[PDB]
From a paper:
Here, we investigate the molecular origins of the nearly billionfold rate enhancement achieved by directed evolution of the computationally designed Kemp eliminase HG3 (7). The Kemp elimination is a well-studied model for proton transfer from carbon that has served as a benchmark for de novo design. All HG3 variants have an inactive conformational sub-state, rooted in the original protein scaffold, which was gradually supplanted with a catalytically competent sub-state as evolution progressed.
Cryogenic structures of HG3 and HG3.7 in the absence of a ligand revealed that β-strands 6 and 7 (located adjacent to the binding pocket), adopt two distinct backbone conformations whereas only a single conformer is observed for HG3.17. One conformation matches that seen in the corresponding complexes with a transition-state analog (TSA), and presumably represents the active sub-state. The almost identical positioning of the catalytic residues in the free and the TSA-bound forms of HG3.7 indicates that the active site of this sub-state is already primed for catalysis. In the inactive sub-state, however, a backbone flip creates a steric clash between the carbonyl group of Leu236 and the nitro group of the TSA that would block ligand binding. Importantly, the NMR spectra of HG3 and HG3.7 show analogous features, although their inactive sub-states are populated to a greater extent than in HG3.17. Estimating the respective populations from the volumes of duplicated cross peaks shows that the inactive species comprises ~25% of the HG3 and HG3.7 samples at 25 °C, but only 5% of HG3.17.
Author numbering: 3 to 303
The structure:
């Protein structure tokens, strides 16, 4: 009926995005739906560490080149990531035990990937899932080996590789303003920017269960109080796909001036890691769901 991407742009936002990759675009109706209803794409796997650098100093961009090219041929924006995070990390990186070696390896990984597509990517997720639930920093190899300074180093290196890209930190379970994790990332991002770390945005990996949409109305403005130029809703998916939960997340972005857009975790329910919860906006027939139509109604003039 109508494209939620074109409709959110009519409300002053930048995009309504979706995660995908080569294996999704070559089968089913994925390519047709993304072309019609979305305006930005994110790689699920093709830009993770294990896919781009399975051996030290030896890079590959088979899947990444495919998605970037497809986006350009079809007029879609591109987001990249995740550059520094403990998931999809080859064991050869986690086995490094000394500060300088891991720092140089981390810097070389950031620079190589961002340099390849310099000027073509809007968002780069530079650091992901860096916080524990209590607000302390996750004890990853980067924190244990390099120390707390690895987050400053990552962002400063990314800014030099492509000053045109918006540099994001992202994390999950930032969906309630009363959650210690939400308050912690706000405090640290404020201190980091005052220390010269160029963090452009905060991305909330909004993986919700039924009824958790309302809490985002007050959690998102709290995230925006960190002073970053931008914030965004990343990897959105809701168990049950209730129209009310989805509309609440859309209203949150509409009420936060610094919120630039929303990105969903996928297209069709059967292609989700938790597909048995039917958490996306398209069913097993690749047809719109009630939540999709509710977003359309919420975004019309």
């Amino acid at each position: 009926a109508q494209s939620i991407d074109q409709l959110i742009k009519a409300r002053g936002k930048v995009y309504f995005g979706v995660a995908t990759d080569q294996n999704r675009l070559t089968t089913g109706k994925n390519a047709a739906i993304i072309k019609a209803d979305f305006g930005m794409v994110w790689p699920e796997n093709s830009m993770q560490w294990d896919a781009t650098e399975p051996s030290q100093g030896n890079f590959n961009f088979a899947g990444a080149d495919y998605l970037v090219n497809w986006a350009q041929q079809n007029g879609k924006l591109i987001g990249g990531g995740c550059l520094v995070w403990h998931r999809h990390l080859p064991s050869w990186v986690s086995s490094i035990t000394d500060k300088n070696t891991l720092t140089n390896v981390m810097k070389n990984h950031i620079t190589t990937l961002m340099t390849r597509y310099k000027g073509k990517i809007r968002n780069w997720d530079v650091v992901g899932e860096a916080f524990n639930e209590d607000g302390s920093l996750r004890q990853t190899v980067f924190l244990n080996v390099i120390g707390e300074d690895y987050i400053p180093i990552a962002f400063q290196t990314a800014r030099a590789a492509d000053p045109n890209a918006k540099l994001y930190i992202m994390d999950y379970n930032l969906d309630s303003a009363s959650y210690p994790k939400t308050q912690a990332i706000v405090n640290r991002v404020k201190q980091w920017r005052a220390a010269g770390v160029p963090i452009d945005g905060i991305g909330s990996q909004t993986h919700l269960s039924a009824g958790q949409g309302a809490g985002v109305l007050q959690a998102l403005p709290l995230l925006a109080s960190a002073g970053t130029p931008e914030v965004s809703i990343l990897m959105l998916d809701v168990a049950g796909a209730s129209p009310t939960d989805y509309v609440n997340v859309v209203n949150a972005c509409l009420n936060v001036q610094s919120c630039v857009g929303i990105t969903v975790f996928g297209v069709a329910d059967p292609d989700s890691w938790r597909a048995s919860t039917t958490p996306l906006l398209f069913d097993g027939n690749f047809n719109p769901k009630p939540a999709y139509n509710a977003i359309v109604q919420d975004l019309q003039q």
